[PDB]
Amino acid sequence: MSAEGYQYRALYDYKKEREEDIDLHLGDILTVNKGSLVALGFSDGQEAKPEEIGWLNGYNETTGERGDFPGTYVEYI
Amino acid sequence: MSAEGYQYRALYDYKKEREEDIDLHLGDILTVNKGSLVALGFSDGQEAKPEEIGWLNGYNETTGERGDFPGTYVEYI
Amino acid sequence: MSAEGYQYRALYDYKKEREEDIDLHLGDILTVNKGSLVALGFSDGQEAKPEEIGWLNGYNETTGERGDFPGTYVEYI
Amino acid sequence: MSAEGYQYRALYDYKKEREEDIDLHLGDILTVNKGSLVALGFSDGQEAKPEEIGWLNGYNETTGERGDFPGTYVEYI
Amino acid sequence: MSAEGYQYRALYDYKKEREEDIDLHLGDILTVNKGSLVALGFSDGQEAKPEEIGWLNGYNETTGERGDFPGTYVEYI
Amino acid sequence: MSAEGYQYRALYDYKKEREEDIDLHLGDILTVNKGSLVALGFSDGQEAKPEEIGWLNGYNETTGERGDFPGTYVEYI
Amino acid sequence: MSAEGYQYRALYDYKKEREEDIDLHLGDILTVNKGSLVALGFSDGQEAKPEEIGWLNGYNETTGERGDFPGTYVEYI
């Protein structure tokens, strides 16, 4: 198993578990705004994205790309 | 197994589990705005995307690309 | 198994599981706006996309591309 | 198995599971606007797309492309 | 006299001159290409625009806009 | 006289001159390419714009905009 | 006379001169390429713009903007 490169997160997972009778309770979320609000530039104001998912066993991206996003791929063979 | 490159998330998952009788309760989400709001530039105001999914076992993208997005692919063979 | 490149998420999934009698309760989502709102530029106001899906076992894109999006593919063989 | 390239999500899924007697309850979504609203530019106001799907086992795109979208394919053989 | 703003070239010219018996000789321009040439992407090859003007006393634009050019004007009064 | 702002070139010219019997000789320009040339991406090859002007007393733009050029003006009054 | 701001070149010119019988000789320019050339990315190859002007007394821009150029103006009054 090999990895190289600049900024990478390479988890090599090997887990074997028996997990029984778990009760887990999170709680709720409240965001309140009262009053006059002015937001300027790369500001936000009150950015508030509610994402409620149950049973993540795969892959999830919630990707907010806000701005100016260039990308150049260059390969010589 | 090999990986290289600039900013990558290469998880190599191997998990074998038995998971029984789990009760899990999240809770709710409330966002409130009272008052006069002015948003300018790459600001947001109150951006609030509700995504409720149950049983993610595959792949999910919620991708908000807001702005100016160039992309150039260049390959020499 | 090989991977290279600039910003990639290469998950190599291998999972073998037995999962029984799970009760899971999420909760609800409320977004409220009271008052005069002015949104300018790449702002949003209150962007609020409700996506309720059950049993994601495959692929999902909710892709909001808002703005100016060029793309150039160039390949020499 | 090989992958290269600029910004890619290459999941190589291999999952073998037995999944029984799951009860899962999401909850509902409410978005409220009271008051005078002015939206300008690449703003939104209250963009609110309700997508309720059950049993995603394949592929799904909800793609909102709002703006100016050029694309050039160039290939030399 | 007032100026503000992001990237501006505000010349405030005040010149009072007496200019006599000037002899000025520029010379010529030659561009030669020999050989096989392949140009790809936002490349050029040999872009070679000959502009010969005499006695510029006003305004001149030779503007080569090659590509993808969006522009949005937004004004609230 | 006032100036502010981000990246500006504000020349405030006041010049009063007597300029007599000047002989000035520039010389010529030759660009030669021999051989096989391949240009890829935002490359150029041999970009070679010949601009010969005599007696610039006003304004001149030779503007090569090659690529992807968005612009957003946003003003609240 | 006032100036402020981030990166500015504010020349406040006041010049009063008598300039007589000047002989000035520049010389010529030759660029030669022999051989196989490959240029990739934001490379150039041999970019070679010949600009021969005589008697610049005003303003001149030779502006090569090659790439991805966003600009956002935002002003609240």
Author numbering:
A (entry chain G), B (entry chain E), C (entry chain C), D (entry chain A), E (entry chain B), F (entry chain D), ...: 1 to 77
Paper quotes:
Here we present the high-resolution cryo-EM structure of amyloid fibrils of the Src-homology 3 domain of phosphatidyl-inositol-3-kinase (PI3K-SH3). The structure of natively folded PI3K-SH3, a domain consisting of 86 amino acids from bovine PI3K, has been well-characterised by X-ray crystallography and NMR spectroscopy. SH3 domains are known to play a significant role in several signalling pathways where they mediate protein-protein interactions by recognising PxxP sequence motifs. Used initially as a model system for protein folding studies, PI3K-SH3 was among the first proteins discovered to form amyloid fibrils in the test tube, while not being associated to any known human disease.
A three-dimensional density map for the thick PI3K-SH3 fibril could be reconstructed to an overall resolution of 3.4 Å. The clear density of the fibril allowed us to build an atomic model for residues 1–77 out of a total of 86 amino acids. The missing nine residues are located at the C-terminus, which shows blurred density likely due to substantial flexibility. The thick PI3K-SH3 fibril is a left-handed helical structure consisting of two intertwined protofilaments, and is thus called DF (double filament) fibril. Protofilament subunits (PI3K-SH3 monomers) are stacked in a parallel, in-register cross-β structure. The helical symmetry is therefore described by a twist of 179.4 ° and rise of 2.35 Å, which corresponds to an approximate 21-screw symmetry. Each protofilament subunit, or PI3K-SH3 monomer, consists of seven parallel in-register β-strands (β1, aa1-5; β2, aa7-19; β3, aa22-26; β4, aa28-34; β5, aa46-56; β6, aa59-68; β7, aa72-77) that are interrupted by either sharp kinks, glycine or proline residues—or a combination of those. By encompassing 13 residues of each monomer, 26 in total, the inter-filament interface of the PI3K-SH3 DF fibril is very large. The protofilaments mainly interact through two identical symmetry-related hydrophobic patches at the periphery of their interface, between the bottom part of the bent β-arch motif and the respective C-terminal part of the opposing protofilament. A single subunit in the PI3K-SH3 DF fibril is not planar but winds itself along the protofilament axis, which leads to interlocking within a protofilament.
